[PDB]
């Protein structure tokens, strides 16, 4: 019943500083090291360092020596990690994990046995900007689309015909660029239903509390 609970996701402006938390429960907090790892979008895992709560002793990866700072608090069974000068490359998912039981006194496996759920972090200097929804109309089956451009922050909820159209739908993951997100979604219907029958994509961006409906009309040019 061991458990590691990390703070919630977070947005941060460049150059800023950040402090994540990893609360432990289910085992003696001071008896085990807590490791910190970074998983980059390409899925690459990097080891940042570890903290020994019983000693406050720290071992860190040479690559994050002056960028990350680990501390713990016995009183709250929580480990923390502070990221300084937050640049764009610092956007990733960060994990805390427990070192497994030692082999013998002072001899360890350096194998993490219990992990936290992860805490995403996006470094963008943008403001909660609603998106511009553009219709993608073609020039047996037909493919239509919607471009949800320039929003922040995630997520957006795209649907087709309020949900009546669920089959033949592809909604691509959002990609961040110029501190702003861009997503797109496609749907394929029989050519014997469009433009005969109406098709529209419904885009909801909770952060702006904006909801939008865009009808896909054939381009006459």
């Amino acid at each position: 019943q061991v458990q590691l609970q990390q703070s919630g996701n977070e947005l941060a402006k460049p150059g800023a500083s950040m402090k994540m938390s990893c609360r432990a429960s289910g085992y003696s907090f001071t008896s085990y090291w807590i490791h910190w790892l970074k998983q980059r979008p390409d899925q690459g895992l990097e080891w940042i360092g570890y903290i020994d709560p019983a000693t406050a002793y720290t071992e860190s990866n040479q690559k994050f020596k002056d960028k990350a700072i680990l501390t713990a608090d016995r009183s709250s069974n929580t480990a923390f990690m502070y990221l300084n000068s937050l640049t764009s490359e610092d956007s990733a998912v960060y994990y805390c994990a427990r070192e497994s039981p030692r082999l013998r006194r002072g001899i360890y496996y350096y194998a993490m046995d219990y992990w936290g759920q992860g805490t995403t972090v996006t470094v963008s200097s943008a403001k909660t900007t609603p998106p511009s929804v553009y219709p993608l109309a073609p020039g047996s089956m037909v493919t239509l689309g919607c471009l949800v451009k320039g929003y922040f922050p995630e997520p957006v909820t795209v649907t087709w015909n309020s949900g009546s159209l669920s089959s033949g739908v592809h909604t691509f993951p959002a990609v961040l660029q110029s501190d702003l997100y861009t997503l797109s979604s496609s749907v394929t219907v029989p050519s014997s239903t469009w433009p005969s029958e109406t098709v529209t994509c419904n885009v909801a961006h909770p952060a702006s509390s904006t909801k939008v409906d865009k009808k896909i009309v054939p381009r006459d040019c």
Binding site: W47, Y109, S132, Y134, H170, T182, S186
Partner: protein, 212 residues
């Protein structure tokens, strides 16, 4: 300068098959090597430590062997919940490092992509922007290369690509590529082309349009 090399990067298989991932060290690290598994939307999970010692509840089909500079993780009779990413980690020296991973995906028959190209919508041009979108849906395998041509020429910048993960129903992949321009640039030229190369065709798969 201890580099860990995992191969192959992707392993395409059917349930019931047997596979073995390789993880090689650029220097002898004895048996100081552990294996992890990461399924989508989940955090890594320890599978094997010290090259060969399996962890408590790890199904017996997972077997690790190796020593020195060569390690191998095998799964005899792969089940469907074994699909995901597998990483090896050295614990020989500092800093601790991981290999790049090996993805295990579900194999299926090759499928050519259905391609669609869309010119900018008037609604966006009026705001001074021009985004040309190209959808490449339901193909397999995963590897695909998309190139953008404007009047028979290549454009490297302003291109946003996004991929879906393997589909649960038909196991194919999909991708969308957007080329974002200036209402200006967009009007200097006339022919816009989405070009793709995939296993299913020796010649480029093309979709194009002139703004006429």
């Amino acid at each position: 300068d201890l580099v860990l090399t995992q191969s192959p990067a992707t392993l395409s298989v059917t349930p019931g098959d047997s596979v073995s991932f390789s993880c090689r060290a650029s220097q002898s690290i004895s048996n100081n090597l552990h294996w992890y598994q990461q399924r989508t939307h989940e955090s890594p999970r320890l599978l094997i430590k010290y090259a060969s010692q399996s962890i408590s509840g790890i199904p017996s089909r997972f077997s690790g062997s190796g020593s020195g500079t060569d390690f191998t993780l095998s799964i005899s009779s792969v089940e469907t919940e074994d699909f995901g990413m597998y990483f090896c980690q050295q614990s020989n020296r500092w800093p601790l490092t991981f290999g790049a991973g090996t993805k295990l995906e579900l194999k299926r028959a090759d499928a050519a992509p259905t391609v669609s190209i869309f010119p900018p919508s008037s609604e966006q041009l009026t705001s001074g922007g021009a985004s040309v979108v190209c959808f490449l849906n339901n193909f397999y395998p995963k590897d695909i290369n998309v190139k953008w041509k404007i009047d028979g020429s290549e454009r490297q910048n302003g291109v946003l690509n996004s991929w879906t993960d393997q589909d649960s129903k038909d196991s194919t992949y999909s991708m969308s590529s957007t080329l974002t321009l200036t209402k200006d640039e967009y009007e200097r030229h006339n022919s816009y082309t989405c070009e793709a190369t995939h296993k299913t065709s020796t010649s480029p798969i093309v979709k194009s349009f002139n703004r006429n």
